[PDB]
Design a protein around this ligand. Structure first.
Ligand SMILES: OC[C@H]1O[C@H](O[C@H]2[C@H](O)[C@@H](O)[C@@H](O[C@H]3[C@H](O)[C@@H](O)[C@@H](O)O[C@@H]3CO)O[C@@H]2CO)[C@H](O)[C@@H](O)[C@@H]1O
Ligand code: CA
Ligand code: CA
Ligand code: CA
Ligand code: CA
Ligand code: NA
Length: 483
């Protein structure tokens, strides 16, 4: 069976403490539509109750300790999350946990630290003489005590921070101490992009590295996770991320599928990350996201023959996680670059019915986003489900590509003898509709095939040679399968 990942959250999921219950109630439905793995949001306590999880305070508080004025996280309590994972698991759906290791936010108090300012466009350059600041680096975990881990954090466990409480100014401060320096290797944008926001963890510190490995093993075992999504990978020492993943696999004996968020629209740089991590993890195909978005926004003028150009999936198909949109690219967000609604079903056809890549479905696209703009994503589940059924039941066997026209492009899947009635013919167009003759296999000769999306009502008959003439409406998608 073809695997399909589901991102189970959007930026504006409500702070009602019921997200784990929602997941538990949706488990049967997700298993019935073909989802094989769910990516859940950061499950540990944030700087406040309403933080989405990307400003993590305590990685060992999964919503059971009274800290930051709340027991539960935004999403719910620990026992509610364990019950949700339990329902997914009894329906053979895997669970991937979001892992936020770059920084820590919401310290309990400030400490005095000697620091220097650096050039925001070249963090290897120091731009001030050293002086004293009051930084938020003291993490004590008053509501947890020593439960699970007695480690406490201090300034010397971080490389730098962005706020001096003394002067009430925001700069990029690098701390002075024993062997203090920005980690390497990281992205070389801005000279060295180790530093991002909040208090930046120092992955040169031996105790920090050992503790974070231990935490990783604990987390996987405490929730029985099947894999991980690594946040902000380009800002974290690459060799450390390689070793951390390996240590968790060594201790659990599990495969621990892992996908890293390496946010850069450049295949060469993504390839550098795969090599530096010994190919032990996949990456999200950022470039493909931008190609799809570009196509959706040029009103038919995009050359559809170029959709694969510069993508990770054309070079390292087995290590790519393909996606249409996510919580960062949705409207109003930091990396906003939404795939226009009219093209969204065409983009889902492209990632769900092609043989390469591991495709992700966005929660926001299935159910609608609840942000406050006038351009929110509408609920598209009634248009996506038919394509997911095409992936689950027909997308098997040899593939043939027809990237031969600036608007109308298609592909076919011959089917596999072990999946009864499998096989399909897909066509998409960023402009006027039309036709294309394509080969689906001589073993399907004589069959009556129909558009499972319902966009076209006229069936097509496969000729005695295994070729059919397929049609597609303007700015639309058609996916033909056995009637
Ligand atoms: O529970 C569903 C399914 O889970 C298990 O399969 C997982 C794989 O073990 C895991 O590797 C991953 O597969 C992806 C590849 O790693 C990637 O390179 C590319 O080829 O795409 C694959 C997904 O199609 O994910 C699947 C789950 O999605 C288990 O092996 C199955 O038997 C089980 O039914
Ligand atoms: Ca360092
Ligand atoms: Ca960093
Ligand atoms: Ca075009
Ligand atoms: Ca057939
Ligand atoms: Na660092």
């Amino acid at each position: 069976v073809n695997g399909t990942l589901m991102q189970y959250f959007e930026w504006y999921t409500p702070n009602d403490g019921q997200h784990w219950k929602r997941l538990q109630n949706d488990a049967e439905h997700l298993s019935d539509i073909g989802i094989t793995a769910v990516w859940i949001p950061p499950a540990y306590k944030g700087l406040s109750q309403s933080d989405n999880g990307y400003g993590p305070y305590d990685l060992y508080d999964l919503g059971e300790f009274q800290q930051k004025g709340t027991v539960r996280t935004k999403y719910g309590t620990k026992s509610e999350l364990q019950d949700a994972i339990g329902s997914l698991h009894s329906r053979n759906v895997q669970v991937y946990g979001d892992v936020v290791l770059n920084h820590k936010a919401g310290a309990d108090a400030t400490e005095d630290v000697t620091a220097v300012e650096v050039n925001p466009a070249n963090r290897n350059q120091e731009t001030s003489e050293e002086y004293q600041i009051k930084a938020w680096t003291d993490f004590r975990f008053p509501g947890r005590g020593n439960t699970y881990s007695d480690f406490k954090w201090h300034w010397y466990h971080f490389d730098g921070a962005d706020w001096d409480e003394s002067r009430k100014i925001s700069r990029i401060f690098k701390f002075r101490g024993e062997g203090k320096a920005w980690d390497w290797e990281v992205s070389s944008e801005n000279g060295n992009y180790d530093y991002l926001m909040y208090a930046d963890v120092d992955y040169d510190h031996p105790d920090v590295v050992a503790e974070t490995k231990k935490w990783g093993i604990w987390y996987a075992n405490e929730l029985s996770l099947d894999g991980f999504r690594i946040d902000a990978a380009k800002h974290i020492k690459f060799s450390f991320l390689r070793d951390w993943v390996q240590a968790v696999r060594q201790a659990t004996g599990k495969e621990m599928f892992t996908v890293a968020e390496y946010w850069q629209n450049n295949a060469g740089k993504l390839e550098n990350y795969l090599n530096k991590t010994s190919f032990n993890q996949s990456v999200f195909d950022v470039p493909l996201h931008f190609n799809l978005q570009a196509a959706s926004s040029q009103g038919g003028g995009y050359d559809m023959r170029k959709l694969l150009n510069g993508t990770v999936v054309s070079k390292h198909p087995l290590k790519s996680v393909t996606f249409v949109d996510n919580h960062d690219t949705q409207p109003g967000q930091s990396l906003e670059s939404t795939v226009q609604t009219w093209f969204k079903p065409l983009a889902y056809a492209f990632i769900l019915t092609r043989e390469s890549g591991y495709p992700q479905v966005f929660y926001g696209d299935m159910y609608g986003t609840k942000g406050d703009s006038q351009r929110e994503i509408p609920a598209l589940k009634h248009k996506i489900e038919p394509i997911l059924k095409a992936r689950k039941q027909y997308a098997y066997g040899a593939q043939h590509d027809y990237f031969d026209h600036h608007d109308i492009v298609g592909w076919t899947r011959e089917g596999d003898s072990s999946v009864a009635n499998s096989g399909l013919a897909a066509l998409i167009t960023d402009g006027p509709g039309g036709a294309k003759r394509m080969y689906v296999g001589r073993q399907n000769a004589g069959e009556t095939w129909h558009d499972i999306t319902g966009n076209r009502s006229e069936p097509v008959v496969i000729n005695s040679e295994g070729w059919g003439e397929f049609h597609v409406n303007g700015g639309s998608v058609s996916i033909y399968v056995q009637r």
